[PDB]
Amino acid sequence: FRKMAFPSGKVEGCMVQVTCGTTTLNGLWLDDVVYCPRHVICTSEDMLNPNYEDLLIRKSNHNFLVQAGNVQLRVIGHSMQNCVLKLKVDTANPKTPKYKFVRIQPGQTFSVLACYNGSPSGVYQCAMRPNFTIKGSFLNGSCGSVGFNIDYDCVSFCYMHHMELPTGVHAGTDLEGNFYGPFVDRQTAQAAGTDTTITVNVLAWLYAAVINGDRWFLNRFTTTLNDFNLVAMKYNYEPLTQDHVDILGPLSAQTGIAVLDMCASLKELLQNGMNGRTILGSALLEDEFTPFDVVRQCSGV
Amino acid sequence: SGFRKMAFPSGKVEGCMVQVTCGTTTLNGLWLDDVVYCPRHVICTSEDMLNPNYEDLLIRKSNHNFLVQAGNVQLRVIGHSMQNCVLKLKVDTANPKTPKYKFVRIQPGQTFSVLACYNGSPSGVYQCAMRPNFTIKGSFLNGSCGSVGFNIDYDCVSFCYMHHMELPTGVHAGTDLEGNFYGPFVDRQTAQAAGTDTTITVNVLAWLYAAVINGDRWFLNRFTTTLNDFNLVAMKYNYEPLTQDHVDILGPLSAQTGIAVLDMCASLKELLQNGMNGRTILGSALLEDEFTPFDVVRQCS
Ligand SMILES: *[C@@H](O)[C@H](C[C@@H]1CCNC1=O)NC(=O)[C@H](CC(C)C)NC(=O)OC[C@@H]1CCC(=O)N1Cc1ccc2c(c1)OC(F)(F)O2
Ligand SMILES: *[C@@H](O)[C@H](C[C@@H]1CCNC1=O)NC(=O)[C@H](CC(C)C)NC(=O)OC[C@@H]1CCC(=O)N1Cc1ccc2c(c1)OC(F)(F)O2
């Protein structure tokens, strides 16, 4: 059972390089518009406390160099929507997929296409943490890399990358330019709120470990939803809602394990530990698979 | 901690996937220039899979018995031949999305990305390591055969794996793109068993180098060993012996850290013989063996 990213080709065809001054990062080119982080317009000194509206009015279209491979695209207009800069260019991207912009919920997963200088570098699956960070792999020059999900042939973009926090986690916006979380695109040290574990996802992953014939963790005990949630919250796990229980049905039916029976198993693991043993390889409980993720990977989408 | 299994962007390979059908048996093929490569067992009915005679099955076949499709568009077959366990179908159209490519045969311990495909359609991409027993731990469902594993160096796709089967323990086996199986497996629907697996020592050493790069270096000792002494001890812990090629591919990390490979070997030996003693490395009490030296450099630097 594998953490699996969406095929990235439809997104690769949209990545371009955007430069302003000595600053270079990635942009996303959809039809005749290039989307990128607005802090591209900032110098070193600008980044410590940037008045973006002020810095933006002092720029011309010709301050922005956009490159699709070897080809420069001419910027014929620019505007700003929250923390994203939109650069209108004179050519349409014929590789534009069917797409939508979505804001994802904490606990949901998406694929990241990490890019440098407009060139795709790697792809991997991430979850929006409850504290609205993401545990990504992003180096200098990764900004403007995007996160996405694919449904049929439609790409739903949900994340654009802007920053790293001192703990090594990452923060960014949706494609409307609104940050996930209480962060700001200024070069200052920013801490996140206390993170919590995505309980419905841990439960999905336990079911997966069962489906792959691993069940040392199961038990005869059982629990009410509320008593589970009391213990969950004590251990900085998110509460489990009835809709979460509903979502887990399919995995429940599949294995013949009632959701609340699996909650009892997870409660025992929280309280006792893994006593050295491991599940699907991991010394640690995994919380970045949604129920959909586990199912779709026992379906074949 | 802070390391992710990261796959290569899959777009260049997505542009090469097709489906190949013989009667009702459909699997995936790889379309490069005017040849489609696929597992030869596409020519087998279930009765043939039980104990197939491939050369006889192939002589009964003509070009017009092979249905090759890119999406729903038929690609006409104008020639067919068998190379080891792969079928080569000459087609009348050169794939306009053919990337720069080569066919490489990887060594155990090397990692690659798998683009899991069904009916010629990509479902997901993920990183795999070739185990020392020549199996991989994939996520492969019915209809996945002919999915390929690859690395991308610059813009050149090195195809190293094509999927053919599952083993009784639920791990996976297949061939290179010349059709030669990795490991002592054959494409027949008979129960086969993989060698007992071992830990990929070269990758563990890469992981220790990664830890040192990130400032986690308690396990470094003042000592060294010969390669032979290390190998004899390591085999007692179900670790793979190192090869000269392993020593060579650790060169860049050795140089980056100034820690000679054989000194790191001595550090590892001490971890094996004395244990971790309740310590963590990179956040874990488990040594990771599915990140190659290349993987470490790509995520550190
Ligand atoms: C893309 O332009 C780039 C992406 C970064 C670079 C390294 N990894 C990334 O993800 N963005 C930025 O550099 C971003 C630009 C601002 C104008 C928004 N700055 C940034 O991340 O600066 C440091 C960061 C801002 C928020 C915060 O708390 N810090 C301070 C900090 C201090 C020490 C750190 C650290 C961040 O990350 C660390 F590496 F772990 O150590
Ligand atoms: C692609 O055509 C397909 C891929 C399979 C489908 C399920 N997972 C896969 O990887 N290949 C085959 O079905 C393949 C075709 C033959 C011509 C090789 N056969 C196959 O995998 O047959 C079963 C397998 C062959 C070697 C072996 O020992 N077996 C028997 C077996 C028994 C019990 C199993 C098992 C395999 O896998 C298990 F799920 F773990 O349980």
DSSP state letter for A146: E
What's this structure's resolution in Å? 1.7
Q: Say how many Å lie between the first and final Cα of chain B, rounded.
A: 15
Cα separation, A176 vs A28, whole angstroms: 13
Report the residue from A122, A213, A300 with minimal CB separation from B8.
Answer: A122
A185 lines ligand 1 (CB under 6 A): yes
A209: amino acid identity, one letter:
A
Rounded to the nearest angstrom, the gap between the alpha carbon of residue A183 and the centroid of all alpha carbons in its chain is: 15
| Domain map (residue ranges) of chain B | 11-175, 201-300
Other residues' Cβ atoms within 10 Å of the Cβ of residue A201: 24
Backbone angle region of A262, left / alpha / beta, with phi > 0 → left and psi within -120 to 50 → alpha: alpha
Tokens linked to B217: 């270096």
Domain B11-175 sits in CATH at 2.40.10.10
A130: amino acid identity, one letter:
P
B293: amino acid identity, one letter:
P
Dihedral (CA of A276, A279, A282, A287) sign: negative
DSSP for A23-76? EEEEEEEETTEEEEEGGGG--TGGGGS--HHHHHHT--GGG-EEEETTEEEPEE
Domain B201-300 sits in CATH at 1.10.1840.10
Q: Are A153 and A97 in contact (CB under 8 A)?
A: yes
- What chain A residue is nearest to B1 in terms of C-alpha separation? A168
**Per-residue exposure over A5-29, b if at least 16 CB sit within 10 Å of its own CB, e if not:** bbbbbbbbbbbbbbbbeebbbbbbb
Report the residue from B7, B118, B285 with minimal CB separation from A122.
Answer: B7
Tokens linked to B62: 């003509």
Q: Which residues of B touch A213 (CB under 8 A)?
A: 170
> Which amino acid residue places its CA nearest to atom 5 of ligand 2?
B165
Interface of A with B (CB under 8 A): 1-10, 12-13, 113-114, 120-124, 135-137, 168, 212-213, 278, 283-284, 297-298, 300-301
Domain A9-173 sits in CATH at 2.40.10.10
Place of tokens 């067919």: B80
- Radius of gyration in angstroms for the set of CA atoms belonging to chain B, rounded to a whole number: 22
Cα separation, A31 vs A93, whole angstroms: 5
The fourth-level CATH superfamily of domain A199-296 is main proteinase (3clpro) structure, domain 3 (1.10.1840.10)
A143: annotated active-site residue = yes
Q: Of B107, B108, B111, B122, nearest to B30 (Cα)? A: B122
Write a three-state SS string for chain B.
CCCCCCECCCHHHHCCEEEEEECCEEEEEEEECCEEEEEHHHHCCHHHHCCCCHHHHHHCCCHHHCEEEECCEEECEEEEEEECCEEEEEECCCCCCCCEEEECCCCCCCEEEEEEEECCEEEEEEEEECCCCCCECCCCCCCCCCCEEEEEECCEEEEEEEEEEECCCCCEEEECCCCCECCCCCCCCCCCCCCCCCECHHHHHHHHHHHHHCCCCCCCCCCCCCHHHHHHHHHCCCECCCCHHHHHHCHHHHHHHCCCHHHHHHHHHHHHHHCCCCCCECCECCCCCCCCHHHHHHHHC
Task: Choose from A1, A4, A112, A133 for mutation: most chain B CBs within 10 A.
Answer: A4
CA of B113 to the centre of ligand 2 (A): 21
Q: Which residues of A touch B126 (CB under 8 A)?
A: 2-5
Q: Are A1 and B116 in contact (CB under 8 A)?
A: no
- What chain B residue is nearest to A120 in terms of C-alpha separation? B9
Instruction: Provide the 3-class DSSP secondary structure of residue A241.
Output: coil
Cα separation, B189 vs B183, whole angstroms: 16
Dihedral (CA of B47, B51, B52, B53) sign: negative
Other residues' Cβ atoms within 10 Å of the Cβ of residue B228: 10
Q: Could you say which ligand is closest to the alpha carbon of residue B117?
A: 2
CA torsion angle B271 B272 B278 B284 (round to 10): 80
Q: Of B105, B126, B90, nearest to B6 (Cα)? A: B126
Cα angle vertex A266, ends A265, A270, to 5°?
A: 120
Cα separation, B10 vs B4, whole angstroms: 17
Report the residue from B4, B12, B124 with minimal CB separation from A6.
Answer: B124
Dihedral (CA of A61, A62, A68, A71) sign: positive
Cα separation, A95 vs A164, whole angstroms: 30
> In DSSP terms, which residues pair with B90 in a beta bridge?
B35, B79
> In DSSP terms, which residues pair with B25 in a beta bridge?
B22
Q: Of A171, A141, A177, A147, nearest to A159 (Cα)? A: A147
Cα separation, A140 vs B171, whole angstroms: 37
Residues of B known to be catalytic: 41, 145
